Amino acid sequence: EPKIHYRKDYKPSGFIINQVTLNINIHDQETIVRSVLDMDISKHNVGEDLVFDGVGLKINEISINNKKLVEGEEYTYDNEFLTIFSKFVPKSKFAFSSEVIIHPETNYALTGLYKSKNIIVSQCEATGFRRITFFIDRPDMMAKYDVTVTADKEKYPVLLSNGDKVNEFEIPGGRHGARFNDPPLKPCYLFAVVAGDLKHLSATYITKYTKKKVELYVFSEEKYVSKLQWALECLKKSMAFDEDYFGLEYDLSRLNLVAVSDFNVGAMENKGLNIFNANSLLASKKNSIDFSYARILTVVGHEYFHQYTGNRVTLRDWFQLTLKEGLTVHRENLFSEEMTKTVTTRLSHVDLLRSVQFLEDSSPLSHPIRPESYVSMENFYTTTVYDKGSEVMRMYLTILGEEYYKKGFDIYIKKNDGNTATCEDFNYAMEQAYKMKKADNSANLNQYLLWFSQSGTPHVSFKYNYDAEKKQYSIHVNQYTKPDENQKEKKPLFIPISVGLINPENGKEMISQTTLELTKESDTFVFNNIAVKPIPSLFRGFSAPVYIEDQLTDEERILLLKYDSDAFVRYNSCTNIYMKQILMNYNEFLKAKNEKLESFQLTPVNAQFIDAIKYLLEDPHADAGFKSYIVSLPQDRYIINFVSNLDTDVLADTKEYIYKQIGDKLNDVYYKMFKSLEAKADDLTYFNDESHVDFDQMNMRTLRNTLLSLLSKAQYPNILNEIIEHSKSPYPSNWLTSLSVSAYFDKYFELYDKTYKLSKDDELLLQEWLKTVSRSDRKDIYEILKKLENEVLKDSKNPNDIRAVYLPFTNNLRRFHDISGKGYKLIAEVITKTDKFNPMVATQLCEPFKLWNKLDTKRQELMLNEMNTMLQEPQISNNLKEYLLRLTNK
Ligand SMILES: O=C(CNc1cccc(F)c1)N[C@@H](C(=O)NO)c1ccc(Br)cc1
Ligand SMILES: [Mg+2]
Ligand SMILES: [Mg+2]
Numbered sequence: 001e002p003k004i005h006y007r008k009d010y011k012p013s014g015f016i017i018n019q020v021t022l023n024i025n026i027h028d029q030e031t032i033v034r035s036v037l038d039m040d041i042s043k044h045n046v047g048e049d050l051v052f053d054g055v056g057l058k059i060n061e062i063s064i065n066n067k068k069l070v071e072g073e074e075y076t077y078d079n080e081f082l083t084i085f086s087k088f089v090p091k092s093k094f095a096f097s098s099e100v101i102i103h104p105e106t107n108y109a110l111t112g113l114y115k116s117k118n119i120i121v122s123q124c125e126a127t128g129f130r131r132i133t134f135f136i137d138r139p140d141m142m143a144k145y146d147v148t149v150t151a152d153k154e155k156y157p158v159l160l161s162n163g164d165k166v167n168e169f170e171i172p173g174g175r176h177g178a179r180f181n182d183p184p185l186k187p188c189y190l191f192a193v194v195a196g197d198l199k200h201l202s203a204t205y206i207t208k209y210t211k212k213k214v215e216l217y218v219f220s221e222e223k224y225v226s227k228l229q230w231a232l233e234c235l236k237k238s239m240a241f242d243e244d245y246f247g248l249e250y251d252l253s254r255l256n257l258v259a260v261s262d263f264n265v266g267a268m269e270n271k272g273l274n275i276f277n278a279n280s281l282l283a284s285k286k287n288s289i290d291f292s293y294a295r296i297l298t299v300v301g302h303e304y305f306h307q308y309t310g311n312r313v314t315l316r317d318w319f320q321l322t323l324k325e326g327l328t329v330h331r332e333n334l335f336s337e338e339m340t341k342t343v344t345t346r347l348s349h350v351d352l353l354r355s356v357q358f359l360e361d362s363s364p365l366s367h368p369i370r371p372e373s374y375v376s377m378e379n380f381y382t383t384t385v386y387d388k389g390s391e392v393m394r395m396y397l398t399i400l401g402e403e404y405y406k407k408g409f410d411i412y413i414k415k416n417d418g419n420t421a422t423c424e425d426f427n428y429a430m431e432q433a434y435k436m437k438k439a440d441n442s443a444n445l446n447q448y449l450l451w452f453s454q455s456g457t458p459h460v461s462f463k464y465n466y467d468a469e470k471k472q473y474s475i476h477v478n479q480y481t482k483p484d485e486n487q488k489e490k491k492p493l494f495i496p497i498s499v500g501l502i503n504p505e506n507g508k509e510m511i512s513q514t515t516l517e518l519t520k521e522s523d524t525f526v527f528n529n530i531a532v533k534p535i536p537s538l539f540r541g542f543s544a545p546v547y548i549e550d551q552l553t554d555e556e557r558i559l560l561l562k563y564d565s566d567a568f569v570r571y572n573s574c575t576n577i578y579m580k581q582i583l584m585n586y587n588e589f590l591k592a593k594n595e596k597l598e599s600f601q602l603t604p605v606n607a608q609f610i611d612a613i614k615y616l617l618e619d620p621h622a623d624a625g626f627k628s629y630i631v632s633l634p635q636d637r638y639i640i641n642f643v644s645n646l647d648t649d650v651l652a653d654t655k656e657y658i659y660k661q662i663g664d665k666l667n668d669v670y671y672k673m674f675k676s677l678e679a680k681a682d683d684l685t686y687f688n689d690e691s692h693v694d695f696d697q698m699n700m701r702t703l704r705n706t707l708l709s710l711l712s713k714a715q716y717p718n719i720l721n722e723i724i725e726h727s728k729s730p731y732p733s734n735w736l737t738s739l740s741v742s743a744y745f746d747k748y749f750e751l752y753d754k755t756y757k758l759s760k761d762d763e764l765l766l767q768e769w770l771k772t773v774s775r776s777d778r779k780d781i782y783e784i785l786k787k788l789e790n791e792v793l794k795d796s797k798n799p800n801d802i803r804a805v806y807l808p809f810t811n812n813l814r815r816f817h818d819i820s821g822k823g824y825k826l827i828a829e830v831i832t833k834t835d836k837f838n839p840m841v842a843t844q845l846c847e848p849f850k851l852w853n854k855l856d857t858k859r860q861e862l863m864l865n866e867m868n869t870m871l872q873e874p875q876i877s878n879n880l881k882e883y884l885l886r887l888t889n890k
């Protein structure tokens with residue numbers, strides 16, 4: 001009886017918690033938590049027992065109105081629920097109090113109160129607050145918080161919680177306390193406490209409209225405080241963006257960001273006290289790869305934007321998760337697009353969605369962005385809820401345009417500020433803007449709500465007609481979502497299709513900006529006074545989260561790739577050319593294998609496509625990040641959505657052939673660009689200025705490192721010389737790339753030892769080194785992973801360490817999917833081992849298995865055997881069991 005929670009079952013509690021008064025006393029062997037809950041009986045009360053969530057708590061005593069309750073007669077506790085029998089529950093306002101013991105030192109699951117290195121830190125979302133003290137641990141129980149933290153002063157000089165610090169005091173025996181009062185109501189998942197020997201950088205921010213001074217503090221352990229500078233700049237940028245785009249100011253006197261080494265995810269938006277995985281807050285040019293800079297910008301931005309979308313407007317219940325996470329990812333994405341000013345930012349989010357999230361949505365794990373049920377709330381945090389949620393949130397902007405979107409968002413904030421909300425509240429606010437935009441009080445967005453309830457990726461397909469005599473162009477559009485286990489019957493969605501029409505003679509735009517509103521299963525959109533047969537530029541900006549079936553020829557796609565104005569359609573046209581090639585070569589390789597052919601033919605790569613790649617690479621005005629995408633084949637996890645029973649060896653052979661076909665024609669171009677890009681890509685002018693971040697320059701390094709990888713796999717003449725020189729670059733993105741691309745040479749372990757020595761004295765850099773080794777294209781990768789286990793990883797319980805060692809390796813198409821199943825067995829062993837102390841990270845480590853039923857039948861069987869073996873572990877967590885049961889359709 002695992003307990004399934006159903007969305008439709010939501011009901012308000014029969015109780016109210018008005019005030020929380022906490023005393024958290026941190027000692028060497030245990031932490032004592034005293035809590036007084038000022039409570040009341042709600043209008044929904046029907047005489048029920050008072051049931052608190054409380055997981056793993058050691059009760060010293062519990063009381064109601066300062067009378068101790070007697071265990072067994074007046075309450076029972078089973079280590080997960082505290083039940084006070086209703087006859088002992090007061091009928092009016094009452095105080096519930098308790099003193100419990102918890103043990104952050106041994107809390108390796110990193111939820112509740114835990115110790116990360118020498119920092120005590122909390123993580124309460126989603127169900128962590130009940131691991132600190134008793135509570136009705138659900139986001140609609142809004143309360144005021146008065147929190148006192150005490151600790152050894154020498155070990156823990158910096159004490160932080162939500163709200164204003166109202167008192168600091170000394171305590172006999174070398175201890176000290178601080179009291180924080182946070183009067184605004186909040187759900188308990190936004191509570192946080194931090195204690196440690198933290199060092200900070202700080203700044204003052206003056207808000208745009210009210211001219212309020214906000215103190216900004218960024219904290220880390222002392223060793224890494226020099227890595228906080230970029231994060232502080234990102235925070236300032238985030239504040240300014242919400243002010244400028246949304247007209248939203250921060251409301252509190254202070255905002256703290258804190259980095260900790262042990263963290264299950266990226267960061268957490270606790271009010272006034274955002275807590276980060278160190279890998280998403282700390283960077284320096286000497287000790288971080290380039291990706292750290294966009295990561296810190298987006299994660300700092302993301303947690304900041306939660307202050308409105310999640311904190312001030314919060315959730316009624318956890319099924320609304322996408323209302324704060326999809327919306328905050330959308331706000332994050334707008335922010336990062338404006339901050340980076342590169343088209344690759346949007347392309348990178350599409351690239352993530354169509355690989356990772358599309359795979360999830362065609363898997364047995366498929367769910368709508370608002371699921372109907374759950375067992376483990378932690379399994380709800382998914383790329384579907386986050387990234388498809390973000391695309392659903394972004395479609396409102398595409399449909400409404402900026403002006404009316406901003407009006408609708410402001411309606412949402414004004415109407416729900418300080419309250420809980422549901423997805424309907426957001427859709428209602430957008431609907432008001434829709435009415436305004438359409439000048440039609442009857443217009444509604446009722447159909448739009450299916451984006452919240454309908455799982456699965458829509459497929460959108462096209463047919464075209466041009467009447468030259470009439471100058472009349474027609475686009476016939478069809479939408480189809482495959483039935484799945486959530487809906488037998490799928491319904492047509494409100495799909496906005498941003499379109500242009502390119503004149504194939506001169507590459508020019510043929511019509512103004514147009515967004516087709518597809519609301520039926522099919523429609524025909526006609527355009528008059530189209531002087532010449534156009535090439536349609538469909539779903540510009542990737543305007544809906546769908547499979548696009550453009551039915552264009554490769555000649556048409558090539559022309560869009562060269563000449564269209566829209567970065568996404570160019571990238572997608574290139575993607576589609578590659579996919580046609582991959583599917584064709586895959587089937588030719590497969591047939592040869594199946595028929596045991598002694599000889600056979602392969603269809604070559606389209607020569608005009610290769611010419612078009614060359615043309616774009618040689619265009620000095622073209623974006624270097626975009627160029628890096630066009631020379632890269634689509635992600636394996638994008639491809640697998642298009643192949644049944646995918647044989648990973650055959651796919652590996654297919655990609656190799658296509659990369660070789662192209663490199664045989666373009667390697668001299670790749671080499672020449674690799675060399676000519678050096679000066680601007682590796683410019684050291686601002687290497688010691690942590691405020692100066694140039695996303696274009698970083699994209700040129702991406703392009704250089706992509707080209708170097710291509711040339712190294714090709715064994716381009718004397719490229720090992722370039723690899724060795726590149727290992728001497730000051731930039732870790734370069735010298736770690738030199739390690740990875742040296743895999744094809746006898747110098748690999750020389751560079752392995754060199755880069756280890758460069759990486760070993762920075763915690764986060766070492767983790768980047770581990771990832772690079774893990775992802776190295778090495779025939780001896782299994783022996784290398786054993787070396788990492790024995791010599792570096794050891795028995796670390798740090799999630800960054802475990803993820804770094806194992807997850808990149810699972811993208812090794814040839815070796816992770818070794819037909820013996822040894823790679824599946826390896827990851828399953830790591831999952832089961834990790835599950836003993838950290839169920840959430842154990843489920844993250846399951847991610848390679850998400851495509852299990854898409855592989856060839858033997859690998860299906862191998863993966864299924866490992867997950868059935870994992871499901872049979874007597875000690876399996878609820879999180880892992882529920883995940884594997886759903887993934888294996890059991
Ligand atoms: O750090 C991230 C990265 N996103 C993310 C992570 C895991 C799965 C997934 F689909 C997306 N997410 C934060 C967040 O939303 N911070 O605001 C978060 C996630 C889970 C919980 Br429990 C609390 C917080
Ligand atoms: Mg305990
Ligand atoms: Mg199923």
Ligand SMILES: [Zn+2]
Pocket residue numbers: 269302306324325328
């Ligand atoms: Zn979030």
